[PDB]
Amino acid sequence: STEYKLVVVGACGVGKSALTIQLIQNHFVDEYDPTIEDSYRKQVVIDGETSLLDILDTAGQEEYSAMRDQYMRTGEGFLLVFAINNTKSFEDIHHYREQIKRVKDSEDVPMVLVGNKSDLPSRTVDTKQAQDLARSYGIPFIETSAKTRQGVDDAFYTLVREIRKHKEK
Ligand SMILES: CCC(=O)N1CCN(c2ncnc3cc(-c4c(C)ccc5[nH]ncc45)c(Cl)cc23)CC1
Ligand SMILES: Nc1nc2c(ncn2[C@@H]2O[C@H](COP(=O)(O)OP(=O)(O)O)[C@@H](O)[C@H]2O)c(=O)[nH]1
Ligand SMILES: [Mg+2]
């Protein structure tokens, strides 16, 4: 019934594709084409409501595009994905939030901070500083792992609930 247009952003290799494939198809991919930038549909039930999730898995190159601007303009919620073992990807989160705020012309955009690869032991980004950033953005923070599926459902579902609150707001 209700359609939700989600967009997954984040640096290369943080697990954007792997997180999306786990949600849609329930399996962890060891490798996925890092150039494929396409959207995926899936019908789910969230808080007792049939929701049609339309999830754009961003990839491609590091270039600006008026077409990519339309992607964020069409999107209703955004997953800010970084890898807990890649400090560079965590620093990139600011850039991705800035580019989304640039398009939608608003600081009130449904977003969720996603710390991926929580199964890995080589942690370089503290949970506290990830919570501190999400607090500063005023958005939820969820630690996920596309390998064990831990936190994957909670990541996308929280974004859907953020969109619902934004609609009432
Ligand atoms: C495997 C390689 C990989 O996963 N990539 C994914 C991230 N890509 C990006 N890198 C740097 N900045 C990027 C900026 C944008 C962007 C955003 C977030 C919002 C509006 C926009 N309008 N035009 C571009 C844009 C996007 Cl969609 C991707 C970026 C590199 C390849
Ligand atoms: N251990 C672990 N590895 C992951 C996880 N998510 C993704 N990966 C690995 O990270 C690599 C790149 O993931 P990918 O989905 O292509 O990231 P993307 O470029 O942002 O789309 C892949 O080889 C995956 O096996 C995770 O939650 N845990
Ligand atoms: Mg990918």
Swiss-Prot record:
One Gene Ontology biological process: response to glucocorticoid
UniProt-annotated binding residues for GTP: 10-18, 29-35, 59-60, 116-119
Superkingdom of origin: Eukaryota
Gene3D superfamilies in UniProt: P-loop containing nucleotide triphosphate hydrolases (3.40.50.300)
Alphabetized InterPro entries for the sequence: P-loop_NTPase (IPR027417), Small_GTP-bd (IPR005225), Small_GTPase (IPR001806), Small_GTPase_Ras-type (IPR020849)
Bilayer topology annotation: Lipid-anchor
SUPFAM superfamilies linked to this entry: P-loop containing nucleoside triphosphate hydrolases
SMART domains with a match to the protein in the record: RAB, RAN, RAS, RHO
UniProt keyword annotation of GTP-binding present: yes
Recorded GO MF terms: G protein activity; GDP binding; GMP binding; GTP binding; GTPase activity; identical protein binding; LRR domain binding; protein-containing complex binding
Recorded consequence of changing residue 60 to R: In CFC2; characterized by a defective GTPase-activating protein sensitivity and a strongly reduced interaction with effectors
Glycosylation sites: 35
Effect of residue 38 to A: Decreased interaction with MAPKAP1/SIN1
Self-association state and partner proteins as the record states: Interacts with PHLPP. Interacts (active GTP-bound form preferentially) with RGS14. Interacts (when farnesylated) with PDE6D; this promotes dissociation from the cell membrane. Interacts with SOS1. Interacts (when farnesylated) with GPR31. Interacts with RAP1GDS1. Interacts (active GTP-bound form) with both SHOC2 and PP1c (all isoforms) to form a tertiary complex; SHOC2 and PP1c preferably bind M-Ras/MRAS, but they also bind K-Ras/KRAS, N-Ras/NRAS and H-Ras/HRAS. Interacts (GTP-bound form) with MAPKAP1/SIN1; inhibiting K-Ras/KRAS activity.
Family the entry assigns: Belongs to the small GTPase superfamily. Ras family.
Protein name from the UniProt record: GTPase KRas
Source organism of this protein record: Homo sapiens (Human)
